[PDB]
Amino acid sequence: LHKEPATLIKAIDGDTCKLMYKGQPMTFRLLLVDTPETKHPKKGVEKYGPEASAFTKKMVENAKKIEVEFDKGQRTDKYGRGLAYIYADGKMVNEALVRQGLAKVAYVYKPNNTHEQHLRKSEAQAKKEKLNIWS
Ligand SMILES: Cc1cn([C@H]2C[C@H](OP(=O)(O)O)[C@@H](COP(=O)(O)O)O2)c(=O)[nH]c1=O
Ligand SMILES: [Ca+2]
């Protein structure tokens, strides 16, 4: 996979944000993870939702460098959102959330699963430490 620079425009929630990519603003959704809902009335404001939003926000707003890394399959979902692994100063936001118990590994659609094993390994650690979502 190849990392590419992006510029933070606006953090939305734990797993969705707006970035300036290749000159154009675009919304991104983190690959292989799911942070709790804070919008959509059908899901409601789920537990740890606000926590996940704050974690992501802090991490991306304080970063000197943000990079996007598309996987090997489709790069956007049905809603026109870019699907990527996002790095804040070299640290993957996707993994950071999972390791903290702020997100679950989900939506594993191949072949967009290059980092699946890595994220699962972190999820198991968060689980055995009964962190947040796993408490
Ligand atoms: C992470 C991811 C989400 N999605 C879809 C699945 C869900 O569709 P539905 O809206 O049909 O449930 C939605 C989950 O994202 P949200 O967690 O932002 O809702 O976006 C993909 O299609 N591919 C992906 O890789
Ligand atoms: Ca979500």
Three-state SS annotation for 66-131? EEEEECCCCCECCCCCEEEEEEECCEEHHHHHHHCCCCEECCCCCCCCCCHHHHHHHHHHHHHCCC
**Measured between alpha carbons, how far is residue 101 from residues 44, 52, 98, 114, 132 in Å?**
19, 9, 5, 21, 5
Determine whether the annotation assigns residue 15 to a binding site: yes
Q: What CA–CA distance (Å, rounded) separates 22 from 7?
A: 9
Instruction: Report CA 118 to chain centroid distance, whole Å.
Output: 14
Element holding 21 (H helix, E strand): strand 16-21
Residue partners of 71: CB distance under 8 A and separation at least 6: 1, 31, 83, 84, 85, 111, 112, 113, 114, 115
Rg (CA), the chain: 14
The technique by which this structure was obtained is X-ray
Q: How far is the CA of 29 from the centre of ligand 2 (A)?
A: 9
Which domains, ranges and CATH numbers included, belong to the chain? 1-135 (2.40.50.90)
81 noted as active-site residue: yes
75 noted as active-site residue: no
State which ligand 1 atom lies nearest to the alpha carbon of 106. Answer: 1
Task: Say what the resolution is, in angstroms.
Answer: 2.0
Q: How many CB atoms are closer than 10 A to CB 53?
A: 20
**What single letter denotes the amino acid at residue 99?**
R
Q: Residues enclosing ligand 1, CB less than 6 A?
A: 16, 29, 31, 34, 77-78, 83, 107, 109, 112
Sign for the CA dihedral angle at 115, 121, 126, 127 comes to positive
Q: What CA–CA distance (Å, rounded) separates 35 from 12?
A: 12
Query: Which tokens belong to 123?
Result: 């999820």
Q: What CA–CA distance (Å, rounded) separates 125 from 48?
A: 18
Nearest to 105 by CA among 34, 11, 49, 1: 34
Q: For the purposes of burial, counting CB atoms within 10 Å of the CB of 48, is it exposed (0-12), middle (13-18) or buried (19 or more)?
A: buried
Sign for the CA dihedral angle at 74, 76, 82, 85 comes to negative
Q: What angle do CA 4, 124, 44 make, to 5 degrees?
A: 75
Query: Which tokens belong to 51?
Result: 């926590």
69 noted as active-site residue: no
Q: Compute φ and ψ for 73, nearest 5 degrees.
A: -105, -145
